[PDB]
Design a binder for this molecule. Structure first.
Ligand SMILES: Cc1nc(N(C)C(=O)Cc2ccc(-c3ccccn3)cc2)sc1S(N)(=O)=O
Lengths: 448, 384
């Protein structure tokens, strides 16, 4: 069907990735398991040596609705571990890629990477630090997690070395170890790790993923480890619409990471938006992003709610408390009015599917999803059709405006209170400058 | 000797396959099947592929080597049978009329050396795990079953899966399934499934009404729904892979030729940022518009499978650089964008057009809504 004559632009992509992961490292640079010991013994990050954990990156960026997921669909001629940054993203790619062909249950990066329960409740960044790829600052940052993960991994092998020894009697049986054992993590089977929507991750989490991948590959002596094979993270995401510092931003901005990764030769940009169908909205969104100058002409189209009276089935995007106030008053007045009234929200549930009750309300328990009022920050990733924005001035940033106005297919369903392009608004043009220079690079690949 | 790759199925298939190797089993269905002779001009390639199939004969060969397989690599063999006897008749029935192959014929044709050659490493692995012929299924059964679940991934699907993923139409099912799962690896075309579906849609060959118009339940009838299809035998089945290559050649020629112009002009236009983004989107529109994509897809469409006919004609996609690539060097990138959006998005009328409709500056409606705050105190500027 005609909408997929950008698939031809996806093949060069795969070539690079196939080129990028076939590359073997030299033996003196491959990390050795002894490194991951005495990390388990070191009490405070102060004793970490300068050691370069290798990796490669092939980055994917573009607005939502650009078709950035079509690349992840096409990466099923390559052996890969597709993973997501949020459970929502993981399920979204499960549905997206399991609708096209076979697909193993896609987990978040935290199910890979070993992240577990006793890791959310961990304060981070307490240890200080004062460039070279020689990563240490990231592990110092994210050290409670890294330390606990390494201690757990060492505390609990020979699943792979045994087959290697048996073949040393007579490298094949090593590859069949995943088929035989049902617990070995997915980092053990491939070096291509695709991360959907990488902007929802911390800039330290790149180094942590590279670290734990090498750690599992060493603690298990998996064949790719024996092949001097290096991690290849394919970070698909939206830099401008997603937000510390982003992994995608970390890669696009940091000059030593931008030159070790050699991005200009290893980056694809998705320029299209199959979602929006109206021209002026498209031009506005094209400006918001790409950081073009704001004109009175781009005004006069943005020219073209707190009361719950009249916009039923419209989501009011507010910062954190205003949502609570709105929903509270919603429930409070619907008492005197289809619906009725009975922790991420404020208390008391509306019957709009959330209509039936007993207490498996419709489901095991009663933490639920409303999709009625939900903040701008949480609005990211979730694509809607029933938007109505409530910007507050004095802390207005065009990142927030560009997000909030881009959750919906058509501007016919767009409402808000103020003009974010008219009031005082903070310009964060550094990402836009980088992306726009990137487009202007002959080695970068661009897909319409 | 006519080699054949058969993607069979069983009403799990892993349990039946292990049992069949074990000589301990259910009838199987050759869903899609390849056919190739070992050891050329595309004319000769089409002729040989055609002559191997036949309108009448299921397969023009006296001796057959059948690798039965299941679902990088998208299919993986399970066991290799041979057919020299008059049991070849059963193979002809299965490949031609879709009749299931009974287990007894399989066992009588199971070439033990080749089948167990490609299993030995897996038995070794199972033993090693247990230590920490194939008949480990008698004791430590569940472990062997689970390991072979993990080994042949997604080889235990539903009929609905093959019917849904691999096409709604007969043509899509037969040809796309066969190509993608078998001939892509055998024969280039490391393309996604949807890509080959789109290429199949362009394979505009003579369709034929079904002698018994049916469609769709479970694993009994999709085999007869495919092996009897006109598309599985003859010029169509013999010319589909060659046309996949030809279509990709034409496309990639056009797309790469236009990427050259875009990429160069993208890295040489010393230009303002506004005009840069205007230019990038204008170039992509002028090259790959829905109208021009439709024109090129028609230009690459074939109507007769034989590459000697080749109803496809040379494409105009790239030669339409004349309209936009005047970049020899109000600016031109804006005015082309205008004379262009006017076409593809519509006429945006004008302000005077509605000022005529109001002939509110004097019409009382200036105080018709602006003076009607209506309790809210367009409106509230300094609400799209
Ligand atoms: C007439 C025309 N139509 C054109 N299309 C189809 C488009 O822009 C399609 C599009 C629309 C929005 C975006 C986007 C960009 C950044 C953030 C969000 N979304 C990308 C792509 S481009 C031209 S023109 N006037 O240059 O010939």
């Amino acid at each position: 069907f005609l909408n997929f004559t950008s698939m031809h632009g996806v093949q060069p992509i795969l070539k690079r990735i196939r080129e990028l992961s076939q590359q073997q490292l030299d033996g003196a640079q491959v990390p050795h398991l002894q490194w991951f010991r005495d990390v388990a013994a070191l009490e405070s990050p102060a004793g970490l040596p300068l050691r370069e954990f290798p990796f490669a990156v092939y980055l994917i960026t573009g607005n939502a609705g650009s078709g950035k997921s079509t690349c992840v669909q096409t990466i099923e001629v390559l052996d890969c571990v597709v993973t997501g940054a949020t459970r929502i993203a993981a399920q979204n790619m499960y549905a997206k890629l399991s609708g096209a062909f076979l697909s193993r249950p896609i987990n978040t990066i935290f199910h890979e990477f070993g992240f577990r329960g006793n890791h959310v409740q961990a304060q981070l960044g307490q240890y200080p630090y004062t460039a070279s790829l020689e990563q240490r600052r990231d592990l110092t940052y994210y050290w409670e997690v890294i330390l606990d993960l390494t201690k757990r991994a060492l505390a609990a092998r020979n699943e792979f070395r045994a087959l290697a020894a048996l073949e040393r009697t007579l490298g094949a049986l090593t590859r069949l170890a995943p088929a035989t054992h049902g617990a070995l993590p997915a980092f053990t089977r491939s070096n291509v790790i695709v991360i959907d929507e990488a902007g929802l991750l911390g800039r330290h989490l790149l180094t942590a993923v590279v670290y734990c991948w090498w750690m599992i590959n060493a603690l298990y002596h998996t064949p790719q480890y024996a092949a001097r094979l290096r991690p290849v993270l394919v970070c698909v995401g939206s830099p401008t619409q997603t937000a510390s510092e982003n992994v995608l931003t970390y890669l696009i901005c940091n000059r030593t990471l931008r030159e070790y990764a050699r991005l200009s030769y290893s980056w694809a940009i998705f320029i299209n938006n199959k979602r929006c169908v109206e021209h002026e909205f498209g031009n506005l969104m094209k400006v918001l992003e790409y950081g073009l100058p704001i004109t009175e002409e781009h005004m006069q189209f943005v020219d073209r709610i707190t009361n719950p009276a009249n916009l039923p089935g419209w989501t009011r995007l507010f910062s954190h408390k205003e949502v609570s106030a709105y929903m509270a008053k919603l429930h409070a007045y619907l008492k005197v009015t289809v619906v009725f009234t009975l922790q991420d929200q404020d208390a008391t549930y509306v019957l709009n599917t959330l209509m039936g009750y007993t207490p498996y309300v419709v489901v095991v328990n009663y933490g639920i999803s409303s999709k009625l009022a939900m903040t701008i920050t949480r609005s990211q990733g979730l694509s809607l059709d029933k938007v109505a924005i409530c910007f507050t001035p004095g802390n207005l940033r065009l990142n927030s405006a560009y997000v909030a106005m881009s959750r919906t297919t058509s501007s016919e369903f767009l409402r808000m209170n103020l003009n974010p392009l008219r009031e005082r608004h903070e310009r964060d043009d550094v990402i836009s400058e980088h992306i726009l220079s990137a487009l202007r690079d002959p080695n970068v690949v661009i897909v319409y | 000797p006519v080699e054949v790759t058969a993607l069979y199925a069983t009403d799990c298939v892993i349990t039946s396959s292990i049992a069949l190797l074990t000589n301990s089993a259910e009838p199987v269905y050759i869903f899609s099947y390849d056919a190739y002779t070992h050891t050329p001009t595309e004319q000769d390639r089409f002729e040989e592929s055609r002559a191997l199939y036949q309108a009448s004969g299921g397969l023009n060969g006296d001796s057959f080597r059948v690798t039965f397989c299941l679902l990088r690599g998208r299919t993986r063999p399970m066991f290799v049978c041979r057919f020299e006897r008059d049991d070849v008749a059963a193979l002809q029935d299965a490949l031609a009329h879709g009749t299931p192959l009974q287990p007894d014929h399989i066992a009588a044709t199971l070439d033990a050396e080749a089948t167990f050659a490609l299993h030995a490493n897996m038995i070794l692995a199972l033993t090693v795990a247990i230590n920490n012929l194939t008949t480990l299924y008698v004791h430590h059964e569940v472990r062997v079953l689970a390991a072979y679940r993990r080994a042949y991934y997604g080889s235990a699907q539903s009929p609905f899966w093959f019917l849904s993923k691999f096409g709604p139409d007969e043509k899509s099912l037969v040809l796309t399934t066969r190509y993608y799962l078998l001939q892509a690896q055998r024969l280039t075309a490391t393309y996604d499934l949807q890509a080959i579906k789109d290429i199949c849609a362009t394979y505009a060959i003579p369709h034929a009404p079904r002698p018994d118009t049916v469609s769709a339940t479970s694993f009994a009838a999709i085999t007869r729904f495919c092996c009897t299809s006109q598309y599985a035998r003859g010029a169509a089945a013999a010319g589909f892979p060659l046309y996949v290559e030809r279509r990709i050649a034409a496309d990639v020629r056009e797309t790469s030729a236009l990427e050259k112009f875009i990429t160069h002009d993208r890295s040489c236009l010393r230009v303002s940022d506004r005009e840069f983004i205007t230019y990038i989107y204008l170039a992509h529109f002028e090259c790959f518009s829905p109208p021009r994509l439709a024109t090129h897809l028609r230009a690459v469409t074939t109507h007769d499978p034989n590459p000697a006919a080749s109803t496809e004609q040379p494409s105009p996609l790239g030669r339409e650089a004349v309209e936009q690539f005047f970049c020899h060097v109000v600016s031109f990138f804006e005015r082309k964008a205008s004379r262009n959006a006017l076409e593809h998005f519509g006429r945006r009328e004008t302000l005077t057009e509605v000022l005529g409709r109001y002939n509110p500056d004097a019409g009382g409606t200036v105080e018709g809504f602006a003076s009607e705050l209506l309790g809210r105190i367009c409106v509230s500027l300094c609400i799209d």
